[PDB]
mmCIF file of C-alpha atoms and ligand atoms in Angstrom:
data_model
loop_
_atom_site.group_PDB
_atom_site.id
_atom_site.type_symbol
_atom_site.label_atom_id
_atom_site.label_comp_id
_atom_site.label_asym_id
_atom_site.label_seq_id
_atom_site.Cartn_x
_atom_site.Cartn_y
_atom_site.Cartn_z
ATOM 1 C CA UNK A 7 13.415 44.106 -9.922
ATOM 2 C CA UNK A 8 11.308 45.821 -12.106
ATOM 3 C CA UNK A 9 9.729 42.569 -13.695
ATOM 4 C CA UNK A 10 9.715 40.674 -10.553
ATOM 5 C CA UNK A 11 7.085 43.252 -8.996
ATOM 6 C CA UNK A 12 5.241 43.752 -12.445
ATOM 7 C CA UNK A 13 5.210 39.780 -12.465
ATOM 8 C CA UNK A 14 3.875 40.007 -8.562
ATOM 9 C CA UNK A 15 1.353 42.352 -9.278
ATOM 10 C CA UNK A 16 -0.055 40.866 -12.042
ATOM 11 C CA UNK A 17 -3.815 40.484 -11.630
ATOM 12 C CA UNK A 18 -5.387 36.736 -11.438
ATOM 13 C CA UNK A 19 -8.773 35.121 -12.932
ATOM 14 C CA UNK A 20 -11.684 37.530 -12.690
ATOM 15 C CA UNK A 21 -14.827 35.983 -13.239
ATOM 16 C CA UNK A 22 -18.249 38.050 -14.773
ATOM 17 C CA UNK A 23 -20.891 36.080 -12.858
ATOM 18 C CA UNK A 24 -23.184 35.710 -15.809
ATOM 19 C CA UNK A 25 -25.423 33.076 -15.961
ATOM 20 C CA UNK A 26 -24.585 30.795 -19.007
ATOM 21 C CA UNK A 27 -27.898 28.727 -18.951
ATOM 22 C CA UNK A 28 -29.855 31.766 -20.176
ATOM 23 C CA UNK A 29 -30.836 32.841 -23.744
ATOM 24 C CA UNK A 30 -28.099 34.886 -25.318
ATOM 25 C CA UNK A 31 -29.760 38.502 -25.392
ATOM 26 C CA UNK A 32 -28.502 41.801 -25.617
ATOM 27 C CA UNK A 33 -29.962 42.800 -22.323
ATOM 28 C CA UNK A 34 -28.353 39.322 -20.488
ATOM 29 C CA UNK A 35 -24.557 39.584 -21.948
ATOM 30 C CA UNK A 36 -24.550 43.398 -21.216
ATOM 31 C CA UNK A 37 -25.459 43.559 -17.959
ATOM 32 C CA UNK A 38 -22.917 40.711 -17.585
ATOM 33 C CA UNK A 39 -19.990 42.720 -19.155
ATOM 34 C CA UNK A 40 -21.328 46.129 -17.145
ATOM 35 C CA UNK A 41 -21.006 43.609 -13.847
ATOM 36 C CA UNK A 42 -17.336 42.370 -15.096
ATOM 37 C CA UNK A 43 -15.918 46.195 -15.680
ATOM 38 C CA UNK A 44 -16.917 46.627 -12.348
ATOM 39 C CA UNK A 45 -15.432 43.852 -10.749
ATOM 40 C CA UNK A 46 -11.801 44.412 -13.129
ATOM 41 C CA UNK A 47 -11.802 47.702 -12.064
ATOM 42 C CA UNK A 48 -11.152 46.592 -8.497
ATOM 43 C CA UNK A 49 -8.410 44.872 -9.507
ATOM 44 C CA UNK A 50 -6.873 47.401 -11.675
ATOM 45 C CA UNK A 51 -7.094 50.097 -8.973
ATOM 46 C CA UNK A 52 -5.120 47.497 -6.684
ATOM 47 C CA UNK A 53 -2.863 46.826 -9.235
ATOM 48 C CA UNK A 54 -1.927 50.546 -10.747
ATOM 49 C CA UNK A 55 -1.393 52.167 -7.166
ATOM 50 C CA UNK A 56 1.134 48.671 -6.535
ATOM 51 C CA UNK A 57 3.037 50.093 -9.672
ATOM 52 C CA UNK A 58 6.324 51.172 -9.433
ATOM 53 C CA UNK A 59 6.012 55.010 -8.683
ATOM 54 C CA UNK A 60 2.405 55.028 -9.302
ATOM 55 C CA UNK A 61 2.404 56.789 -5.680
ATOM 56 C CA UNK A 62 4.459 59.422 -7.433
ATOM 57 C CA UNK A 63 1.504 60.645 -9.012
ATOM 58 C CA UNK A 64 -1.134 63.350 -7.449
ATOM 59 C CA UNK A 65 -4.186 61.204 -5.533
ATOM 60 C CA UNK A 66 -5.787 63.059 -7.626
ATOM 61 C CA UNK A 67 -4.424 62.171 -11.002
ATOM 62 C CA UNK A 68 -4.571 58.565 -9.901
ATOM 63 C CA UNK A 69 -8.031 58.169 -10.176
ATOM 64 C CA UNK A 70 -8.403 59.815 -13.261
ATOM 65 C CA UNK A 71 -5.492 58.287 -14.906
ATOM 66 C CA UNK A 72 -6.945 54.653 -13.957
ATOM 67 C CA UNK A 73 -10.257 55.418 -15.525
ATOM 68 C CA UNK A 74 -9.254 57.159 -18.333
ATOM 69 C CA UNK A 75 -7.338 53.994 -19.136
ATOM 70 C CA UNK A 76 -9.531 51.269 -18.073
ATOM 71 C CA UNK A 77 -11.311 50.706 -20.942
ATOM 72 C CA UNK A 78 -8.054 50.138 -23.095
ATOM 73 C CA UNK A 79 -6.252 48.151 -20.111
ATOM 74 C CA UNK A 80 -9.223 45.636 -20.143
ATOM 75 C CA UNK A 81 -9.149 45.099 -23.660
ATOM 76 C CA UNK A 82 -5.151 44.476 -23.831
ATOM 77 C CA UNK A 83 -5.746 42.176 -21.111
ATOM 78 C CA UNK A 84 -8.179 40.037 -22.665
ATOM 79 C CA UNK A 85 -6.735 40.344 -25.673
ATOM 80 C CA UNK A 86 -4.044 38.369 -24.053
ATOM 81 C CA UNK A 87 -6.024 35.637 -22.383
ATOM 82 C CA UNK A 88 -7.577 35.123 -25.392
ATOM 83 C CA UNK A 89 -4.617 34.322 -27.332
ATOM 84 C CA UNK A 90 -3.274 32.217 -24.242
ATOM 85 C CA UNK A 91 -6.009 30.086 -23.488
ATOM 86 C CA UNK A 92 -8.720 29.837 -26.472
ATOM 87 C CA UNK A 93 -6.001 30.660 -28.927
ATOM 88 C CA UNK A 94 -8.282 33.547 -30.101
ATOM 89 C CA UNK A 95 -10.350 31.319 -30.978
ATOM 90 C CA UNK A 96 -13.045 33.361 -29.261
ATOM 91 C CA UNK A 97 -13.584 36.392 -26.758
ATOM 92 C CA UNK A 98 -12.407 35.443 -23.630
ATOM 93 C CA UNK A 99 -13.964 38.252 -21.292
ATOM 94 C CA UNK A 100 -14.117 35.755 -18.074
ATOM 95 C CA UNK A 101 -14.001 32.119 -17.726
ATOM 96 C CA UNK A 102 -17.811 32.194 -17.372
ATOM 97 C CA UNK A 103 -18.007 34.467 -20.004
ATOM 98 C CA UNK A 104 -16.727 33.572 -23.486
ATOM 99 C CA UNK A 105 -17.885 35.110 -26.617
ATOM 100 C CA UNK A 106 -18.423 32.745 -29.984
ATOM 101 C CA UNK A 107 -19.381 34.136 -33.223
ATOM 102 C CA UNK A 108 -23.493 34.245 -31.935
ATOM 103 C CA UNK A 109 -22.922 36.120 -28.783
ATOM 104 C CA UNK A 110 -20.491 38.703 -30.505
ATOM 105 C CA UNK A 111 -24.000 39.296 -32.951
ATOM 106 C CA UNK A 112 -26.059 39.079 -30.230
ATOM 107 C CA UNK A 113 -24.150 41.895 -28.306
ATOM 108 C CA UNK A 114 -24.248 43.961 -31.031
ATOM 109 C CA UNK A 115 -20.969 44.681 -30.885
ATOM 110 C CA UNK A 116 -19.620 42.426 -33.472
ATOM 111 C CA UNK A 117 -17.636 45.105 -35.317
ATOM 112 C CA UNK A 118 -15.704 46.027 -32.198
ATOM 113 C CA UNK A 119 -15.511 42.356 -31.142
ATOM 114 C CA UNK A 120 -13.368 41.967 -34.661
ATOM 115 C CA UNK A 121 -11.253 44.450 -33.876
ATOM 116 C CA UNK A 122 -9.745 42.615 -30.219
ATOM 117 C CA UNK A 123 -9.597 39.368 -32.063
ATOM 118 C CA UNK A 124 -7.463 41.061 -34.605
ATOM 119 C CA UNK A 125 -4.850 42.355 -31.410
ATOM 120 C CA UNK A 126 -5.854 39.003 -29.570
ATOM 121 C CA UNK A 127 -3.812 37.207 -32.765
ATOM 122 C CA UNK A 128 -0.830 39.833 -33.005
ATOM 123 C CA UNK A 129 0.058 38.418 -29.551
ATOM 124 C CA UNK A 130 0.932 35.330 -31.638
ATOM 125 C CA UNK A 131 2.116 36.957 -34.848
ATOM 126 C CA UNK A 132 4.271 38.825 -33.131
ATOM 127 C CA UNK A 133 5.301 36.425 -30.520
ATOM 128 C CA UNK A 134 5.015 38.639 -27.752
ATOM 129 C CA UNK A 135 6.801 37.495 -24.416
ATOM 130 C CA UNK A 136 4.638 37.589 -21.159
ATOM 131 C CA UNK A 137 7.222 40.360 -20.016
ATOM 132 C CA UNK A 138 6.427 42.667 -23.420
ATOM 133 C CA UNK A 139 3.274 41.902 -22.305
ATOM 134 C CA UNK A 140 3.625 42.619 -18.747
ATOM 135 C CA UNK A 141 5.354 46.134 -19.344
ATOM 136 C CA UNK A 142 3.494 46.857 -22.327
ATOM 137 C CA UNK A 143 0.188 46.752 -20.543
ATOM 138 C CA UNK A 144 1.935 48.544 -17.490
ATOM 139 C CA UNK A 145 2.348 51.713 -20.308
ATOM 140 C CA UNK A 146 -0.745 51.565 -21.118
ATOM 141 C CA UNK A 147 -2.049 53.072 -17.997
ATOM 142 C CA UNK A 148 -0.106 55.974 -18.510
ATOM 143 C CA UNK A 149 -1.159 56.511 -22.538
ATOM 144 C CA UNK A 150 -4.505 59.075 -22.256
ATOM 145 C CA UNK A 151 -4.533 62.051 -20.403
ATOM 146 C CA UNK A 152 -6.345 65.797 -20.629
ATOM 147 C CA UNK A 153 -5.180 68.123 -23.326
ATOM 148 C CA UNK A 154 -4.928 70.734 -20.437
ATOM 149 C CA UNK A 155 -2.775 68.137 -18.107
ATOM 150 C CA UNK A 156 -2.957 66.673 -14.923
ATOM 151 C CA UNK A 157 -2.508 68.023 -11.083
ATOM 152 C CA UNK A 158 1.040 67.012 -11.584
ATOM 153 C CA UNK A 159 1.819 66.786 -15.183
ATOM 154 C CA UNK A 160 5.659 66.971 -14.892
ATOM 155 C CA UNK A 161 5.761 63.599 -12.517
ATOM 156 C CA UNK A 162 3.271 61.714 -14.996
ATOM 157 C CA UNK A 163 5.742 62.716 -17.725
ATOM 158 C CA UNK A 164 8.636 61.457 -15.885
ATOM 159 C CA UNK A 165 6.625 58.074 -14.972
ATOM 160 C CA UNK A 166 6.044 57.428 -18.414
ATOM 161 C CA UNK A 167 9.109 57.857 -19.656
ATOM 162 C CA UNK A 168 10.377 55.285 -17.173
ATOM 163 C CA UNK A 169 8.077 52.974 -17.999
ATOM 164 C CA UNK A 170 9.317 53.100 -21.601
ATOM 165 C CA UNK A 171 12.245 52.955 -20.789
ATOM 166 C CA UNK A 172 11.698 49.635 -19.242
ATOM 167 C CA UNK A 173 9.892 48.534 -22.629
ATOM 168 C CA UNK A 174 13.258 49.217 -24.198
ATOM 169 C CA UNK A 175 14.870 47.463 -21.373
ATOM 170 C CA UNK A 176 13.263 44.083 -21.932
ATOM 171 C CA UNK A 177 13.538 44.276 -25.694
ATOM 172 C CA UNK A 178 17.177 44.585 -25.106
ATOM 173 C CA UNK A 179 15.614 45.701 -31.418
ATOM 174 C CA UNK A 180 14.332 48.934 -33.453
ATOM 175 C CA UNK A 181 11.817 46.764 -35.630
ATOM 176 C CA UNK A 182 11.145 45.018 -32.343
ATOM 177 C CA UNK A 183 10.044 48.686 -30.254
ATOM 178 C CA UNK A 184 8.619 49.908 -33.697
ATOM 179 C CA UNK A 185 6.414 46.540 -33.735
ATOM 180 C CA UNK A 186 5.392 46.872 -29.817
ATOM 181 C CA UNK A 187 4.596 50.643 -30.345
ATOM 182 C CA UNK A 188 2.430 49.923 -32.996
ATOM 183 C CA UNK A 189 0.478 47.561 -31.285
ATOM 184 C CA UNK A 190 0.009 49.502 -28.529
ATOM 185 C CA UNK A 191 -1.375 52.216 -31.084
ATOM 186 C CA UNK A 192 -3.787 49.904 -31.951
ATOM 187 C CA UNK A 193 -5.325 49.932 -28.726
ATOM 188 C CA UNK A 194 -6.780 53.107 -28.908
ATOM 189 C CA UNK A 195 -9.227 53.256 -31.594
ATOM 190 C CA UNK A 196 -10.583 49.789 -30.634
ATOM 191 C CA UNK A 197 -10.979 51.138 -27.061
ATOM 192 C CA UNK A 198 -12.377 54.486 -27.996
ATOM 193 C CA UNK A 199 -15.144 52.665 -30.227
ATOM 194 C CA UNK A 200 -16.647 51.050 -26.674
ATOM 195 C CA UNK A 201 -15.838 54.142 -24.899
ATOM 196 C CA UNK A 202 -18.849 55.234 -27.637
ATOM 197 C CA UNK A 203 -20.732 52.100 -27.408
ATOM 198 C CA UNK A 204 -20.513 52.687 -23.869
ATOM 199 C CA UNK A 205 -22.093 55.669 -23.453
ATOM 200 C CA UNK A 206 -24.976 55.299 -26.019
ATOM 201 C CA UNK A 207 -25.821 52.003 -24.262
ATOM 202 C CA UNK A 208 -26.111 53.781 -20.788
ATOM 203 C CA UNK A 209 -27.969 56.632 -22.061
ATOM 204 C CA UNK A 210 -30.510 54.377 -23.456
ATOM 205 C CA UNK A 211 -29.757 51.589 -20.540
ATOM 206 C CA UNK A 212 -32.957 52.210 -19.411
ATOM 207 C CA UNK A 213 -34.951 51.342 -22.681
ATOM 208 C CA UNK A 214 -32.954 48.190 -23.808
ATOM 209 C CA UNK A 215 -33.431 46.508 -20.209
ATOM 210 C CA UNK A 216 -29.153 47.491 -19.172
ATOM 211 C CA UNK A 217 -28.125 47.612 -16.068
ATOM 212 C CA UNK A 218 -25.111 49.396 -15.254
ATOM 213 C CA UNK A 219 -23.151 49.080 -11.783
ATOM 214 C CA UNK A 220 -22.501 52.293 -9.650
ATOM 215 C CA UNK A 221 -19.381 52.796 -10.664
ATOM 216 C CA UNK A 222 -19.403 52.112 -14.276
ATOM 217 C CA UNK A 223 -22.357 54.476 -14.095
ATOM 218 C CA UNK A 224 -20.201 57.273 -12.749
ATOM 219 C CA UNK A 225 -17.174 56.373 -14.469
ATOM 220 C CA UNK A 226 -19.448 56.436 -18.271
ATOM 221 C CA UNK A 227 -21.472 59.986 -17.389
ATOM 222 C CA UNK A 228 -18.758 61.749 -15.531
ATOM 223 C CA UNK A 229 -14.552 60.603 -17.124
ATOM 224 C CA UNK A 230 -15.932 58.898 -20.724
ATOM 225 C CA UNK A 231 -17.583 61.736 -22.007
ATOM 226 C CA UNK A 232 -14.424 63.694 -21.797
ATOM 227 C CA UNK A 233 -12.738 61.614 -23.786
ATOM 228 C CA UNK A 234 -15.820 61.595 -26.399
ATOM 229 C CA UNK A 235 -15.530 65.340 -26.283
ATOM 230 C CA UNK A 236 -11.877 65.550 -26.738
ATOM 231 C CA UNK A 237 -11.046 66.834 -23.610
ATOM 232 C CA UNK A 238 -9.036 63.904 -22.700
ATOM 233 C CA UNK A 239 -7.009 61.928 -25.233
ATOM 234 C CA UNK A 240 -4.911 59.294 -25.948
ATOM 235 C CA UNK A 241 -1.163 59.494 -26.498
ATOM 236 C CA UNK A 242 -0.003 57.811 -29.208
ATOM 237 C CA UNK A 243 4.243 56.872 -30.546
ATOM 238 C CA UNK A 244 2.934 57.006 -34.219
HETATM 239 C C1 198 B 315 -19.821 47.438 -22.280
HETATM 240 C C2 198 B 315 -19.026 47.437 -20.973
HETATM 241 O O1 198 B 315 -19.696 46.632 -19.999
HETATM 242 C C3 198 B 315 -18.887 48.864 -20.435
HETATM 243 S S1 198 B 315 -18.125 48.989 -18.775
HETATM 244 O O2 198 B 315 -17.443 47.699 -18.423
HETATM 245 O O3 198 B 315 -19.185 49.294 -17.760
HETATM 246 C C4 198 B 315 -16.939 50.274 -18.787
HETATM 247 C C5 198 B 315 -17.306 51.551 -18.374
HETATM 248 C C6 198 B 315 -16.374 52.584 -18.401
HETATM 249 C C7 198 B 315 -15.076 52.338 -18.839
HETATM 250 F F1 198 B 315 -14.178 53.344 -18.861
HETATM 251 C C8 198 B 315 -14.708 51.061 -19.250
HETATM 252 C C9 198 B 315 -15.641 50.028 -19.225
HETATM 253 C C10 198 B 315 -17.644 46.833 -21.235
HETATM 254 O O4 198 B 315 -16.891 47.330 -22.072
HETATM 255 N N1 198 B 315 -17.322 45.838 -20.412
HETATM 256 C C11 198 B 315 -16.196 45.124 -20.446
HETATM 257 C C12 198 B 315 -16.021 44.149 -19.470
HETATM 258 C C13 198 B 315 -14.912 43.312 -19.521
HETATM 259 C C14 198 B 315 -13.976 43.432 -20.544
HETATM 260 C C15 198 B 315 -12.858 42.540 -20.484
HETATM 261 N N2 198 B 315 -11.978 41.821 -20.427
HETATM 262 C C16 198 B 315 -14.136 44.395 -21.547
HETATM 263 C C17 198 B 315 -13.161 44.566 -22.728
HETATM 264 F F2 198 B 315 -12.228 45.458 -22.408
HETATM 265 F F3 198 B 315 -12.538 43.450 -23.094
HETATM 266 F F4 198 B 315 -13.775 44.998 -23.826
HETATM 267 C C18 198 B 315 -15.252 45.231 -21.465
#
């Protein structure tokens, strides 16, 4: 049951929009990856609150959970189509939207753009199944929260601990949860480096020619810098 509505749920092909018979510039690719958080994050709100207990949670502590996590969702995600399609080969972001080595210089985010190659390959090194993947990513939502807790910490506590319980579930297989742990770890660091990224680029958007949809816009000034301030953070097994 579990699997079959993960599997159901699953979000399909989201495409960025950007127009791929322009010059590579900072200010073009951007704009095109501000666009394409917008439009995932439509999908990821449909597809959290159609989680298993999700419903559980505070309205509240919904919202905030799903854009605390977004960031790190995304770059699981893509990490995974990545490896599926292009053989992380290159950035998949979008089908219209692939990063080669030029675009990840020209986005200036090369460094970070290492970093989810690196996770898009341990999909293959560690020959993770699309369920790992599936309930791996499903944790992930529920893997940063405020230091001071939610509405309804006790029922977020309870959720998660489902939800790895269900990670143990489809592994059975202590190298194989210390393995999957670890590379959920890994998301954090690479997703708090464009949480930063992030909010430098929209406090200067204005200078560097950026444009940042309404909701990113709220999303970067109002739930990002609580994470940068160490309000809100990450939950990590190791
Ligand atoms: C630079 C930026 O455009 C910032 S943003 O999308 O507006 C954003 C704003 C706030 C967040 F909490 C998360 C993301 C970005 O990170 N976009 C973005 C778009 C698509 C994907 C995918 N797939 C990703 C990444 F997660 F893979 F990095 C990132």
């Amino acid at each position: 049951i579990f699997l079959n509505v993960l599997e159901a749920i699953e979000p399909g092909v989201v495409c960025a929009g950007h127009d791929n018979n322009q010059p590579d510039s900072f200010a073009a690719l951007l704009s095109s990856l501000n666009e394409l958080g917008e439009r995932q994050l439509v999908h990821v709100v449909k597809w959290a609150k159609a989680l298993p207990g999700f419903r559980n949670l505070h309205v509240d502590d919904q919202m905030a959970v799903i854009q605390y996590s977004l960031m790190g969702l995304m770059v699981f995600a893509m990490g995974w189509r990545s490896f599926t399609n292009v053989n992380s080969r290159m950035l998949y972001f979008a089908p219209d939207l692939v990063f080669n080595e030029y675009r990840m210089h020209k986005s200036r985010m090369y460094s970070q753009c290492v970093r989810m190659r690196h996770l898009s390959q341990e999909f293959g090194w560690l020959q993770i199944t699309p369920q790992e993947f599936l309930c791996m990513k499903a944790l992930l939502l529920f893997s940063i929260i405020p230091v001071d807790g939610l509405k309804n910490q006790k029922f977020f506590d309870e959720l998660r601990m489902n939800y790895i319980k269900e990670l143990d579930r489809i592994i059975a297989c202590s190298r194989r949860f210390y393995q999957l742990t670890k590379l959920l770890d890994s998301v954090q660091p690479i997703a708090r480096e464009l949480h930063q990224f992030t909010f430098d680029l929209l406090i200067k958007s204005h200078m560097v020619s950026v444009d940042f949809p309404e909701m990113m816009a709220e999303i970067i000034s109002v739930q990002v810098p609580k994470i940068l301030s160490g309000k809100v953070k990450p939950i990590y097994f190791h």
